[PDB]
């Protein structure tokens, strides 16, 4: 199968990695709208229109399915993109809801959603979660995590001080934390260590990764299988510097 | 006189505040490309073209001069903008160079240039200072200041730790600090406080503010006298969050 993956930029790599490791696809066309990144700081009408525009980018590629790796575009643009697209478009929020259902039998478990401002203000996560019977849902816009991560602040005092800034106010101690942004997997264990260091817990909260969750959905929904070729064809495309993006793929993805 | 102000988003307000206090112009059309903010994290090509697209936006408005309030656009897009424009275009780098040339006779004074990644990478400031005979020039990309300032992290521990992270590796004690980004006046006193508090500085460093510097330039170059109408007509446009932009203008600029 030939598919598209769309993200606001390089962050989508966290999803593409899961897809690659699972060997789902013979061909993948990755588009990063990196001239306009971030999306998370911006308004719904702007982001919806970004998502429609990404649809036009894909048209000459004859993809059969579009993955929207971006949790912000997933939260805000996806309904509008699906409305004008014949092929299916799969976002990263719904697959995470299905993963939570499999992994979190206790409907009362405190679940913390972390995301960009736009993702958190949409309440996409909370709404889906409530519909499936969840009763203790909390949310937090950890906005500064995105540029810290862009600047490779993946440990140390500055990261620790930032986490502390966002997490100290929380009144509830989550048993489940949804990593509802492309960037946040890169600080997954530091978030785990934060809660383990700051509270007496025998195990860290369960972390939900958007990549692994969409992999599980794609396998099940499309009978996709971990035996697409050994050397998938993958093209990178960007509205900003595509050579830099390709250089990133080569360094971090081996491609 | 009707003129235009361009910036990547709201940060240009720091320049606009200075323009308004100086009563230089009867009417100002402000445009922020806030669908695509920030520019500072991006590349020459992408930023040159943003700045040519800003020319297009000003065409129906019949402006007589354009001020590029963005330090990043000034650094990367100015020449290209000027190459095509029929009206004078004034950016925020050259006026800062001439402000320094006026206040700082000592060619060995240690001047420190703070900007976005793109601004610093261009060496637009360093080149201009060197041509003016300056021999002691350091630069730092203080990239996380921008998002921290956007999230109103204007004091406290997170700012202090961010500043520590950028300022600690510095091998020269500055006598001149260029606030080479729209956003950095909002923490000017905090920056001055970090240097006075952690080092043995005899007296505060001379801080160069892009807006005060452009004003000085505009007055002198254009023989503008500060005798424009007491309440100028000012319009606010943006590529998104325009409503938000207009709110910010009323709350913060008195407009
Ligand atoms: C995302 C996984 C698949 C690969 N990866 C990584 O494991 N680390 C530890 C990085 O530091 C990194 C970076 C990186 C290079 N410079 C900064 N970093 C963080 N990239 C590229 C990248 C850049 C910016 C944001 C990103 C967000 C998500 C994924 C990759 C990102 N990919 C990176
Ligand atoms: C003319 C400027 C200096 C007036 N002004 C201000 O003095 N403070 C202290 C603000 O906090 C503020 C803000 C603000 C509203 N939300 C966060 N802040 C910081 N704006 C709008 C604004 C927003 C974001 C970044 C900005 C960067 C430069 C100038 C204005 C900016 N203007 C603001
Ligand atoms: N990809 C975005 C993060 C970067 C951005 O804000 O565009 C998300 O997953 O929410
Ligand atoms: N206005 C930009 C800062 C914000 C951005 O990165 O676009 C500058 O002065 O460099």
User: How does DSSP assign B164-232, residue by residue?
Assistant: HHHHTT--S--SEEEEESTTGGGGHHHHHHHHHHHS--SSPPEEEEHHHHHHHHHHHHHT--S-S-SS-
Please name the method used to determine this structure. X-ray
Distance of alpha carbon A156 from alpha carbon B40, whole angstroms: 24
Q: Do domains B1-91+210-255 and B92-209 have the same CATH topology?
A: yes
Q: Annotation-wise, does B143 bind a ligand? A: no
B162–chain A Cβ distance below 8 A for any pair: yes
Q: Provide the pairing of β-strand B176-180 with B206-209.
A: parallel
Kindly report the nearest CA distance between residue A205 and chain B, in angstroms.
Answer: 25
Q: Is B181 a catalytic residue?
A: yes
Q: Is A162 a catalytic residue?
A: no
Secondary structure (3-state) at B113:
strand
B41–chain A Cβ distance below 8 A for any pair: yes
Distance of alpha carbon B28 from alpha carbon B15, whole angstroms: 12
Element (H, E) at A4: strand A2-7
Asked if B4 and B31 count as a contact pair (C-beta separation under 8 A), the reply is yes
Secondary structure (3-state) at B253:
helix
Asked if A42 and A51 count as a contact pair (C-beta separation under 8 A), the reply is no
What CATH code is assigned to B92-209?
A: 3.40.50.1860
- Its CATH class, for the domain covering B1-91+210-255, is alpha beta
CB atoms within 10 A of CB B17: 16
Asked if B2 and B63 count as a contact pair (C-beta separation under 8 A), the reply is yes
Is A181 a pocket residue for ligand 3 (Cβ < 6 Å)? yes
Distance of alpha carbon A20 from alpha carbon A253, whole angstroms: 9
Which conformational region is residue A233 in: left (phi greater than 0), alpha (psi within -120 to 50 degrees), or beta?
Answer: beta
Q: What is the CA radius of gyration of chain B?
A: 18
Secondary structure (3-state) at A32:
strand
Helix crossing, A94-103 with A124-131: angle to 10°?
A: 40
Asked if B27 and B234 count as a contact pair (C-beta separation under 8 A), the reply is yes
Both structure tokens of A120? 């958190």
* Spatial CA neighbour of B52 closest among B40, B62, B44, B41: B44
Both structure tokens of A57? 């980018």
Greatest pairwise CA separation for chain A in angstroms: 54
Q: Which residues contact B166 (CB under 8 A, 6 or more apart)?
A: B140, B142, B144, B145
* Spatial CA neighbour of A197 closest among A146, A248, A154, A163: A163
Distance of alpha carbon A130 from alpha carbon A137, whole angstroms: 8
Distance of alpha carbon A116 from alpha carbon A38, whole angstroms: 9
| In chain A, where the domains are located | 1-91+210-255, 92-209
Q: Where are the alpha helices (DSSP H) in A122-167?
A: 124-131, 145-150, 156-167
B37–chain A Cβ distance below 8 A for any pair: yes
Distance of alpha carbon A129 from alpha carbon A96, whole angstroms: 10
CB atoms within 10 A of CB B79: 13
Counted residue by residue, chain A has a size of: 255
Cβ separation A241–B46 shorter than 8 A: yes
Q: Which residues contact B98 (CB under 8 A, 6 or more apart)?
A: B213, B216, B217
A48–chain B Cβ distance below 8 A for any pair: no
Q: Which of A151, A156, A160 is best to mutate for the B interface (most B CBs within 10 A)?
A: A151
Q: Which residues contact B220 (CB under 8 A, 6 or more apart)?
A: none
Q: List CB contacts (< 8 A) between B239 and chain A.
A: 46
Q: Whose CA is nearest to atom 29 of ligand 2?
A: B11
* Spatial CA neighbour of B78 closest among B89, B63, B88: B89
Q: How far is CA A11 from the centre of its chain?
A: 8
Both structure tokens of B202? 């005899």
Both structure tokens of A251? 């360094």
Kindly report the nearest CA distance between residue B1 and chain A, in angstroms.
Answer: 33
Distance of alpha carbon B34 from alpha carbon A25, whole angstroms: 36
Q: What is the DSSP letter of A185?
A: G
Counted residue by residue, chain B has a size of: 255
Kindly report the nearest CA distance between residue B80 and chain A, in angstroms.
Answer: 18
Beta strands in chain B (DSSP E): 2-7, 27-32, 66-68, 89-90, 111-115, 137-141, 176-180, 206-209, 233-238
* Spatial CA neighbour of A76 closest among A35, A131, A111, A117: A117
Distance of alpha carbon A240 from alpha carbon A197, whole angstroms: 40
Q: Which residues contact B225 (CB under 8 A, 6 or more apart)?
A: B219
Cα separations (Å) of A174 from A122, A123, A195, A205? 21, 18, 9, 6
Asked if A216 and A98 count as a contact pair (C-beta separation under 8 A), the reply is yes
Asked if B96 and B18 count as a contact pair (C-beta separation under 8 A), the reply is no
Whether residue A38 is preceded by a cis peptide bond, meaning omega within 30 degrees of 0, is yes
Ligand 1 neighbours, Cβ below 6 Å, are A 10-11, 13-14, 17, 149-150, 152, 182-183, 186, 248, 252
Q: Which residues contact B192 (CB under 8 A, 6 or more apart)?
A: B177, B204, B205, B207
CB atoms within 10 A of CB A183: 24
C-to-N gaps above 2.5 Å in chain A, after residues: none
Distance of alpha carbon A54 from alpha carbon A32, whole angstroms: 9
Distance of alpha carbon A126 from alpha carbon B49, whole angstroms: 39
Distance of alpha carbon B49 from alpha carbon A65, whole angstroms: 32
Q: What is the DSSP letter of B38?
A: -
Nearest to A162 among B35, B143, B158 (CB): B158
């Amino acid at each position: 199968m030939k598919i598209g993956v769309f993200d606001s930029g390089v962050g989508g790599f966290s999803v593409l990695k899961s897809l690659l490791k699972a060997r789902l696809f013979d061909e993948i066309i990755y588009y990063g709208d990196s001239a306009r990144v971030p999306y998370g700081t911006k308004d719904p009408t702007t982001i919806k229109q970004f998502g429609l525009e990404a649809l036009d980018f894909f048209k000459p590629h004859e993809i059969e399915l579009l993955i929207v790796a971006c949790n912000t575009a997933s939260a805000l643009a996806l309904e509008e993109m699906q409305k004008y697209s014949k092929i299916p478009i799969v976002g990263v929020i719904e697959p995470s809801i299905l993963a939570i259902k499999r992994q979190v039998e206790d409907k009362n478990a405190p679940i913390l959603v972390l995301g960009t401002k736009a993702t958190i203000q949409s309440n996409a996560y909370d709404n889906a979660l409530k519909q499936q019977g969840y009763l203790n849902i909390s949310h937090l816009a950890t906005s500064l995590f995105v540029p810290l991560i862009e600047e490779s602040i993946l440990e140390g005092e500055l990261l620790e001080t930032c986490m502390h800034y966002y997490f100290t106010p929380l009144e509830i101690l989550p048993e489940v934390i949804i990593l509802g942004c492309t960037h946040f997997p890169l600080i997954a264990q530091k978030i785990e260590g934060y809660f383990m260091g700051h509270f007496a817990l025998p195990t860290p909260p369960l972390l939900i990764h958007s990549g692994d969750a969409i992999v599980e959905y794609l396998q099940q929904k499309y009978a996709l299988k971990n035996n697409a070729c050994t050397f998938p064809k993958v093209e990178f495309h960007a509205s900003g510097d595509v050579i830099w993006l390709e250089r990133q793929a080569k360094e971090w993805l081996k491609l």
